[PDB]
Structures are given as structure tokens and as C-alpha cells.
């Protein structure tokens, strides 16, 4: 009744959320390749000083990439959203 | 019944996920502006070598931005949440 | 019906953890980026930094991830309760 309408709508909304999370993941992973190429550029420019972090006398930041979790999780979600 | 409580809970949880997806979108878009300005900086620094990617001798990485889909879908989702809570309250 | 609510539950849990994973990753990347930035500010120090040398308004990171952290934490709580 009103029940079915709501259940259908939730299904739709979960799929929209899956899609947005997956879109964010590709965007984030793409950007990360830009960022790491930038880093390689800076280690080149700072070659005589030991590289970027050595030049800054800072602890070196690395990209801790947790997006495998996202891809595996969202793929499982898409598979289950074939239940209605 | 218990069903009413659960309408309420799901509305809450979807709204929370919507808000969180949007916050992340805004943060990622903002970060990308920093990143691309960094890139222009490196392209200037390596201007004589034909740019960053040329100097690195690398295929050039570009930001595949899908955040437009995200901004659209989440606006739609807020609209739906609001419309459903409005009808329910009616 | 219990089967339905279980399916929704699992789906919401998957989304929560995925959002949280993205959050950890974005926050980590952002540190790499900011450090890159500090690097470019040193390379352009006499010209007033990167932005001045590009003749541009400066981009800064508007970090909204605290909202994501707080909000997902509560979602995990409400999900675990049920
Ligand atoms: Cl960067």
C-alpha cells in the first residue's frame, strides 16, 4: 500500500547512494594520480636537497589508500540491489 | 506500528548518508582546486622542459571529475527525503 | 518483512563503511597535497609564494570531513544497536 511505495523509494535511494559513493571513489582515485605525479615532480625539483620532505625537513606524508574497501563494498551492494 | 519507528530511522539514516556524501563531495572538489593550482605551479616550474609530464617522461594524469553526478543525485535525494517527510507529516 | 529490514540494514552498513573509507582516504590525500603545497611555496618564496607567482587567488582546502566522521560514527551506533 503506502508500504510498497516507501519500499520502492528506499530501494531507489540506496542505489542513488551506491552510485554517488562510486562516482566519488573514481574521482578521488583519479585525483590521487594527479597528486602523486605532482609529488614526483617536486622530488625531481628538490633532487639536490634529498627530495621534497628532506627539503621541508618534515615527516613524509604518504597516501593511505582505503578505496579497495569502497570498490569491493559497492560492487557487493549493486549485486544485492537486484533484490526488490 | 514498529513500522512507523522504522520509517523514521531509515529517513534519518538516508539523510545522514546524504549529508555525508555531500560533505565529502564539497571537500573533494575543494581539495581538487588546490591540487590543480599545484599542477599549474609545476607546469610553470618546468615550462622550459615542456611541462611537468614532459620533464617526468610520463603519460600525463588528469582529474576525472564525476562530482557533477554526485551533486545532482544528492540534491535529488534531499528533495525526496524532504518530500516524503512532508507527506508523512501531512 | 524481517528479511527486508535485514537487507536494508546490511546495505546501510555497507554505505557507512564505504563513506568512512572514502573519508580516511581523502583526509590522507589532503596531507600529501598540503605538503606538496608547502613545497611549491618554498620554491616560489621570493615571489611571495605559489599563488602570487601564478598571479591567482589562492585555493585553500575547505575540509568538511569532521561532519562526515561525526555523522558516520552515529550511523554505526544506530546500526549496531538494531
Ligand atoms: Cl598536489
Going from N- to C-terminal start, the domains of chain C cover 1-82
In chain A, residues with a C-beta closer than 8 Å to the C-beta of C21 are 66-67, 69-70, 73
Tell me how crowded residue B14 is: count the other CB atoms within 10 A of its CB.
Answer: 24
Long-range contacts of A44-50 (CB under 8 A, 24+ apart): A44/B55, A44/B56, A45/B42, A45/B45, A45/C39, A45/C43, A46/C39
Q: Which three cell numbers stand for residue A6?
A: 516507501
Helices (H), chain B: 2-45, 52-56, 67-89
User: What is the number of residues in chain B?
Assistant: 90
The answer to whether B16 touches A12, Cβ cutoff 8 Å, is no
Can you tell me the distance from the alpha carbon of C82 to that of C79, in angstroms, rounded to the nearest whole number? 5
Say how many Å lie between the first and final Cα of chain B, rounded.
Answer: 18
CA distance B84 to chain C (A): 18
Method: X-ray
Residue A48 alpha carbon to ligand 1 centre in Å = 21
Q: Which CATH class is domain A1-84?
A: mainly alpha
Tell me how crowded residue C63 is: count the other CB atoms within 10 A of its CB.
Answer: 16
Task: List C-alpha distances in Å: C59 to A20, B29, B42, C10, C54.
Answer: 25, 11, 15, 39, 12
Can you tell me the distance from the alpha carbon of C49 to that of C38, in angstroms, rounded to the nearest whole number? 9
Whether B24 sits inside 8 A of C68 (CB atoms) is: yes
In chain B, residues with a C-beta closer than 8 Å to the C-beta of A33 are 61
Nearest CB among C59, C65, C71 relative to B37 is that of C59
CATH architecture of C1-82: Orthogonal Bundle (1.10)
What fold is seen in the domain B1-90? Helix Hairpins (1.10.287)
For A33-84, give the secondary structure using H, E and C: HHHHHHHHHHHHHCHHHCCHHHHHCCCCCCCCCCHHHHHHHHHHHHHHCCCC
Residue C21 alpha carbon to ligand 1 centre in Å = 20
The answer to whether C32 touches A63, Cβ cutoff 8 Å, is yes
Amino acid at each position: 500500500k503506502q508500504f510498497e511505495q516507501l519500499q520502492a523509494a528506499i530501494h531507489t535511494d540506496l542505489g542513488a547512494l551506491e552510485k554517488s559513493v562510486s562516482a566519488l571513489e573514481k574521482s578521488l582515485t583519479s585525483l590521487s594520480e594527479v597528486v602523486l605525479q605532482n609529488r614526483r615532480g617536486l622530488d625531481l625539483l628538490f633532487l639536490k636537497e634529498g627530495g621534497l620532505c628532506a627539503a621541508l625537513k618534515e615527516e613524509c606524508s604518504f597516501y593511505a589508500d582505503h578505496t579497495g574497501v569502497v570498490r569491493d563494498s559497492m560492487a557487493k551492494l549493486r549485486e544485492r540491489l537486484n533484490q526488490r
